[PDB]
Design an enzyme around this catalytic site. Sequence first.
Site, PDB file in Angstrom:
ATOM      1  CG  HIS A   1      -1.959  -1.070   1.212  1.00  0.00           C
ATOM      2  ND1 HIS A   1      -3.173  -0.952   0.574  1.00  0.00           N
ATOM      3  CD2 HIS A   1      -1.941  -2.304   1.769  1.00  0.00           C
ATOM      4  CE1 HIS A   1      -3.864  -2.066   0.740  1.00  0.00           C
ATOM      5  NE2 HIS A   1      -3.138  -2.905   1.462  1.00  0.00           N
TER       6      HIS A   1
ATOM      7  CE  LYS B   1      -5.503  13.353   0.489  1.00  0.00           C
ATOM      8  NZ  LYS B   1      -6.595  13.003  -0.468  1.00  0.00           N
ATOM      9  NE  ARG B   2      -4.378  10.237  10.281  1.00  0.00           N
ATOM     10  CZ  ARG B   2      -4.053   9.260  11.123  1.00  0.00           C
ATOM     11  NH1 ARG B   2      -4.828   8.188  11.241  1.00  0.00           N
ATOM     12  NH2 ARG B   2      -2.957   9.364  11.865  1.00  0.00           N
TER      13      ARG B   2
ATOM     14  CE  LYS C   1      -2.681  10.857   3.174  1.00  0.00           C
ATOM     15  NZ  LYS C   1      -3.434  10.242   2.031  1.00  0.00           N
TER      16      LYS C   1
ATOM     17  CB  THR D   1      -9.998   4.986  -1.335  1.00  0.00           C
ATOM     18  OG1 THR D   1      -9.649   5.359   0.001  1.00  0.00           O
ATOM     19  CG2 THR D   1      -9.204   3.755  -1.750  1.00  0.00           C
TER      20      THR D   1
ATOM     21  CE  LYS E   1     -13.692   6.705   0.779  1.00  0.00           C
ATOM     22  NZ  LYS E   1     -13.225   7.041   2.112  1.00  0.00           N
TER      23      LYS E   1
HETATM   24  O1  8GP Z   1      -1.138   3.003   6.382  1.00  0.00           O
HETATM   25  C1  8GP Z   1      -1.018   2.723   5.186  1.00  0.00           C
HETATM   26  N1  8GP Z   1       0.073   2.177   4.644  1.00  0.00           N
HETATM   27  C2  8GP Z   1       1.283   1.776   5.380  1.00  0.00           C
HETATM   28  C3  8GP Z   1       1.204   1.742   6.911  1.00  0.00           C
HETATM   29  C4  8GP Z   1       1.183   0.435   6.116  1.00  0.00           C
HETATM   30  C5  8GP Z   1      -2.175   3.060   4.241  1.00  0.00           C
HETATM   31  O2  8GP Z   1      -3.275   3.315   4.733  1.00  0.00           O
HETATM   32  N2  8GP Z   1      -1.909   3.214   2.946  1.00  0.00           N
HETATM   33  C6  8GP Z   1      -2.980   3.700   2.043  1.00  0.00           C
HETATM   34  O3  8GP Z   1      -3.694   2.578   1.487  1.00  0.00           O
HETATM   35  C7  8GP Z   1      -4.803   2.998   0.670  1.00  0.00           C
HETATM   36  C8  8GP Z   1      -5.609   1.808   0.140  1.00  0.00           C
HETATM   37  O4  8GP Z   1      -4.752   0.865  -0.513  1.00  0.00           O
HETATM   38  C9  8GP Z   1      -4.313   3.826  -0.523  1.00  0.00           C
HETATM   39  O5  8GP Z   1      -5.438   4.364  -1.224  1.00  0.00           O
HETATM   40  C10 8GP Z   1      -3.438   4.983  -0.037  1.00  0.00           C
HETATM   41  O6  8GP Z   1      -2.848   5.643  -1.160  1.00  0.00           O
HETATM   42  C11 8GP Z   1      -2.333   4.450   0.876  1.00  0.00           C
HETATM   43  O7  8GP Z   1      -1.598   5.553   1.416  1.00  0.00           O
HETATM   44  C1  PLP Z   2     -11.896   7.214   2.230  1.00  0.00           C
HETATM   45  C2  PLP Z   2     -11.271   7.649   3.591  1.00  0.00           C
HETATM   46  C3  PLP Z   2      -9.889   7.846   3.724  1.00  0.00           C
HETATM   47  C4  PLP Z   2      -8.894   7.718   2.551  1.00  0.00           C
HETATM   48  O1  PLP Z   2      -8.796   9.019   1.960  1.00  0.00           O
HETATM   49  P1  PLP Z   2      -7.621   9.377   0.903  1.00  0.00           P
HETATM   50  O2  PLP Z   2      -7.843  10.769   0.528  1.00  0.00           O
HETATM   51  O3  PLP Z   2      -7.537   8.347  -0.140  1.00  0.00           O
HETATM   52  O4  PLP Z   2      -6.341   9.291   1.775  1.00  0.00           O
HETATM   53  C5  PLP Z   2      -9.387   8.296   4.905  1.00  0.00           C
HETATM   54  N1  PLP Z   2     -10.201   8.541   5.952  1.00  0.00           N
HETATM   55  C6  PLP Z   2     -11.542   8.348   5.862  1.00  0.00           C
HETATM   56  C7  PLP Z   2     -12.382   8.568   7.114  1.00  0.00           C
HETATM   57  C8  PLP Z   2     -12.096   7.901   4.684  1.00  0.00           C
HETATM   58  O5  PLP Z   2     -13.469   7.684   4.601  1.00  0.00           O
END
Ligand code: 8GP
Ligand code: PLP
Lengths: 810, 810
Positions: free
Chosen positions: B351, B542-543, B548, B650, B654
Amino acid sequence: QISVRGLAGVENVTELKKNFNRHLHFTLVKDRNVATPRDYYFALAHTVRDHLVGRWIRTQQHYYEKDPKRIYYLSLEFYMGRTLQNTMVNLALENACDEATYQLGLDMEELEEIEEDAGLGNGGLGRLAACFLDSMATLGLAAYGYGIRYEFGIFNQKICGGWQMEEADDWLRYGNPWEKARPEFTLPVHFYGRVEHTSQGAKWVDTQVVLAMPYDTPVPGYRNNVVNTMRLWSAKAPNDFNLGYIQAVLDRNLAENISRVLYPNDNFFEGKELRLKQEYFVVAATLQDIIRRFKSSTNFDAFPDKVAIQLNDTHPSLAIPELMRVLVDLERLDWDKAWEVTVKTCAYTNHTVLPEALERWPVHLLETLLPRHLQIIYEINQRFLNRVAAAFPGDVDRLRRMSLVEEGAVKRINMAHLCIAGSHAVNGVARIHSEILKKTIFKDFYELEPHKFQNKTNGITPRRWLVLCNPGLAEIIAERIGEEYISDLDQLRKLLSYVDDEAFIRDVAKVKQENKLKFAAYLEREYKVHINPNSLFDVQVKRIHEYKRQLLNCLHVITLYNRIKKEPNKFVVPRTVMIGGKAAPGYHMAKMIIKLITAIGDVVNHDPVVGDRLRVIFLENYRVSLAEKVIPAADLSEQISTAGTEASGTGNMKFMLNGALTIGTMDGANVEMAEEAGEENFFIFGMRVEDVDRLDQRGYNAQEYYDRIPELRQIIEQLSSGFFSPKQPDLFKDIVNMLMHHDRFKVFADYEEYVKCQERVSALYKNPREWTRMVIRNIATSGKFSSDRTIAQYAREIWGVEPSRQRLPA
Amino acid sequence: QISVRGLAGVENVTELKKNFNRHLHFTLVKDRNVATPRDYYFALAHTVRDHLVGRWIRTQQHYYEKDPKRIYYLSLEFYMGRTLQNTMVNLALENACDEATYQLGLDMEELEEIEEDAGLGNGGLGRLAACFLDSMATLGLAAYGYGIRYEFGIFNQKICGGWQMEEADDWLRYGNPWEKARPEFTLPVHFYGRVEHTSQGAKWVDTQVVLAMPYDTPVPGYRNNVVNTMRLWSAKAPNDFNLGYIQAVLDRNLAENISRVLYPNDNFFEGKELRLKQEYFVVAATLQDIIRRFKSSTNFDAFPDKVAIQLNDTHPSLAIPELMRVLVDLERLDWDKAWEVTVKTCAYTNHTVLPEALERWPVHLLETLLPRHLQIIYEINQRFLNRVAAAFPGDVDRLRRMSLVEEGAVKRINMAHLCIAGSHAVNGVARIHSEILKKTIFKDFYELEPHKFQNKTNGITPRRWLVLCNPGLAEIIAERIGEEYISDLDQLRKLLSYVDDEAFIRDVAKVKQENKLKFAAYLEREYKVHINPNSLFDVQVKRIHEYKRQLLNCLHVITLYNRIKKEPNKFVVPRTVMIGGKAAPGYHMAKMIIKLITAIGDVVNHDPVVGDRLRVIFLENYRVSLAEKVIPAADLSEQISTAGTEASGTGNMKFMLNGALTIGTMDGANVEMAEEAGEENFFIFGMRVEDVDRLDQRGYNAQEYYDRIPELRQIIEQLSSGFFSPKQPDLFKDIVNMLMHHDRFKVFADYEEYVKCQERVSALYKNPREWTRMVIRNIATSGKFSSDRTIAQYAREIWGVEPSRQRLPA
Ligand SMILES: O=C(NC1CC1)C(=O)N[C@@H]1O[C@H](CO)[C@@H](O)[C@H](O)[C@H]1O
Ligand SMILES: *Cc1c(COP(=O)(O)O)cnc(C)c1O
Ligand SMILES: O=C(NC1CC1)C(=O)N[C@@H]1O[C@H](CO)[C@@H](O)[C@H](O)[C@H]1O
Ligand SMILES: *Cc1c(COP(=O)(O)O)cnc(C)c1O
């Protein structure tokens, strides 16, 4: 099957069966193909529980409407045991559930054995609270039991190599279907901090907060549709608690440890900080609940008219200064008014006179943990001693003797003195105990305020201790006098007119034999140990303690063994001596006594010459559920504490109600029991309290008995030489040394009379008919020992409320 | 009310109402006079839950009968969010419950807001697992989600003084009606100990045991009557644990801390022992369950035919050596055979490519905690490197590069290398990410075993992310093409024939406006903050992380502010810039970015000259439930990570599905999204991956941009001088320093193009009709991003099972 178990109506059995299947499916999420006995037990428990809710909701609605005076029973222990059968009995659902489960192809008795005991108590004190809740509900009192929901109750006892091993009682592992979490009523409890004196009043600030989350358990009265509540608090950390990040979350455990485990001490005070926190935790949360409920009925003058707080020993004694704190600091009442209300609201029950059991908290602990309460306690002490000084001018020693503050190495607060000063009533638990309180330990207080001192002899509930554990006996009794006695035990006196009834004599003896067979079978089932059902069942079950003298019992057992070895082909009444009970984890002597008991069995039980004439078995993990099994099976009840040490005892009452004769000293309730049945129908022996005092004044010298009693000398020599511990010759050196040099309980002093008395017991057992007739005389006069009588007295003489036998619409 | 929410039949509404009242009475033990909204929510939850059990039991019975290949998805995170509405949607009970509660005088939407989010995840990785479970159930796969039942999920975020404050997420406080404890399936997990090599095989002895208690949660498929299981393990200490007495019981916490809290890191590796324990705990318990279920169907050759284990990143990588340990040490299979089975059973999903996120455990930790696993890992490494040596003779550097063991200061185990070696399939989560894996970090592995590498572009479930959170949009769409798209999202392409439909254009725009009004109202309700519903909603949720680039967004916002201050009476499209997301507790720079965001708002939001033309709001406590509210209300989706850093993303999907246009870099799935909708319908800007590499080869010098871009210079000077922090002039010194001297993500490099692109966005927003037409082109081509498509690919190309849309008899 039997009458007293209720009707098994067509509609109800059908209804029960469908709800059983509903819960198995929807609640447990299982099907008959993967369901285990435990699954079936839970399906049954939820089915019975459903029948409680309707009554529970309307009972509480009823109290809200009529607003009667509320009784709050504060205790750090509630030894409840199992709840399934008790609920069925009180709701008259036993036969119906028996039939319904039978039709489903299940054995209800098997399912009942799956329930874990709610072992939130150590022994007598905790069990008394449980019997009291049952009686208060049966007598229609608006009563609430308040305590702590320990995650771990009294430890499960395992015997390894003849030694006691303790293991956590994870009673909540599979869930508790009886309780209902009430997170919405969570209350904050404060600790530490400091006191700030401002313009108007003191303020307790900079405190650490712990949340108290309540869990409610229903308490059904006997067939009167009343269902009271037992509310137990659980400790929860606030979410901003300690808020690296991970560590802060993990440290929440520190706060939640308050309700983690029950201190396993019986009649022994351990001044640990965690125990003090538990004591304040229950008191602080409970009082806010009490006041909340009171306001939802400003006029605190009527507080004592709507509230009664009963302190089960000194454990919840902080309720006195906490109530003062709330009234003075928060409600702004003047001291004098607040004190008046507090005294009229609180009542205190003392459960022991042993010095090591009295709570005396170090001032430095209260100073750090509850600074405001310490200040309030000093003020109480000051005003109290001014009253003493005015009543007994110049008596300076009385002042230091009655102070709530004890001087010395470390200053301590005597919690018993605090309780007497702040309660309008103080009672002992048996006539002799209450008299001792006025003549000795509380003599000064009695002289100052004689009106406060009362007696309330203990009792046991006839529902759990007769109907539930001994249906066979309850049945043959109902056949003659009806079922009214179950809630009016005095009616058992009518059985006196059947003492010469040949049919009754036969039935009584038959019930006992069946119970012994059932128990003898159980011993082989779960513990694999063979015993002779034709022998006299001699049992002593209660917590292990030196004052209870299991050691005196041990001496008799060895005497019996030596007498057989001396004259093998001489006839002796066969006996099965059963001793059981847990020892506090840190009580070394108590653990050595358990080891001695098993060591004796190791020798006696394997001696070819003895045969099946004598067996010594140590009953492992004695608890409420085991008591319900062994008591109905007993022939002889051992209540042999040194005169003046057992405040009351309650196990003694259970045995009397179940057809066992009693061998005991004139101690605690034994005195009233013998008085009720007639001394000729009791096996009394040993020194009376007066005899013990004479011996102390003269000086107890165990050596004297050792020198003048050959049989006693032989036993001590066998113990010292390693006769009972071949591989470890001096294993029992501590026991012998204590017996010979520092025995506070005078075991040797009662040895001769005890052995002599035991011979009279064996003589009567040889005459089945006369043994049984004496038994009937005991059962018939056990009515006074029903906790319904006890509670009725508390209600009328202390709480100021009238008991009621009126049914509520179901 | 609306079609897609199902039928509100007469019988069902009546049935729901009675069961609601039944649960309120019997389950919650309350009456309509004392019941609170929370009580009503629980009564509703239990009512809906009942409808799940029947299907749940028969689904599991079905799998037992047909014995299909089982899919086990192992993850340390499952970001589930709320369950009530989702369950109603999947069971077609939404309108019926809406009507039933309406008739009871209750507002269901109000009750839904009471449920706590199951926040057992950090962000994308955890949410992906949740979407996947939904899709696997909807596609009829016999799948099981396995993880840890954290007592505390991701922390609740509070903003104080513009700073992030963390507080424990005590989500289980009021209970969880969805889970079912299964204490009967408790399994032991071992830690520490040592390895003993005997005659036949090695033995792991002297270990400390921790019990794993499972809790099952139902996972309903979309209207197909399939209900799968998510099993989460909870840590329990054995009862003989540590068995003074009190301390031993209190120390049980040590063992139970394993499942206490979720590590709050997103894309960042923290080598803490407790985290390693959590990773082994889930793996050890899960594998025993898997093997148990497999045997209850000796022939491990068929193991890969009946079992598929998907590793969600490297967190559960210990499944590889644990499976080997069980097969070799316990089942006695020869190494080669065991390895064959292991490889054919396991598959690994990567990931991220960020170096700081890769798990590299110190050998000394594994050595002490899991000694047998370390030995197995070395053996695996040895045999693997022999294969490399044989394929690339003499290439010694490749050997050290591919080793599972990394040398240096402290030896470490590269868990990603372990996963590739022991899995038959390795996949990235977006086409560009999977390509990067083969070209860079895993290039050596790709050359050795090209067949193992695959791509599985991520997706999101259209149930939660469209029907549930945006019923208005789901409705107008169903009105035109029916409801089949909900489980076959590709059908949305049919909406392309409505791009010129004036009625549709009007409805689409109307739905968006209504969502914005509803959200604008929410902001004032729970957070008291006024915003203009007519402005363009520019959101980035997002986080918080440097890659980012929330900072690039901040630079644009300040640019907009400075441009307004420069020409106040000039017209500019009104905007409401919303930024939300949590920062890991120990991530300092991330916390400074949140502070910067609120600081900007503090200045911009109170500047009279700006008026309602620009607002900057920081969305507090972003989580799944908040995402369901803000995403449907967004106009512009910010997906601006530096090219090559966001594996997939992801959240971007959405937004596309909910009617927002996207401004972003050609990173992660953004590339495929633009490809699907057409680049003309996407706002792409910035460096591509190739451009970033060129800059690195040349050397990134931020000073260059600062010198050549006057507007950028002004912003940096405002930040450095304290324009956004009057009381603390140098408050943002760390941010400026990083931007100027060590910015790994080249924020300045994309500034010009980003600002230029944003102007094009504003230009299109001024033309409502054309903005909406482009939106329709996005919604219509978002079908590829349904997790149903993603799961169907995993099923066919990795697990070897066929998805099914066949309904099961309800
Ligand atoms: O915490 C994460 N990755 C490393 C800590 C193992 C993580 O949440 N990675 C996340 O995984 C998502 C679904 O595949 C992707 O959409 C994101 O781009 C990726 O950052
Ligand atoms: C979908 C979702 C994420 C992932 O968001 P990205 O912009 O792809 O990092 C993170 N947090 C929540 C609460 C979500 O619903
Ligand atoms: O633990 C106890 N007392 C001190 C520790 C407070 C306790 O259980 N005392 C017990 O209370 C019972 C009921 O009143 C009596 O029957 C017993 O005689 C008494 O020992
Ligand atoms: C009744 C009871 C007690 C009290 O017994 P005594 O002999 O009065 O000390 C202790 N433990 C259990 C389990 C009991 O049921």
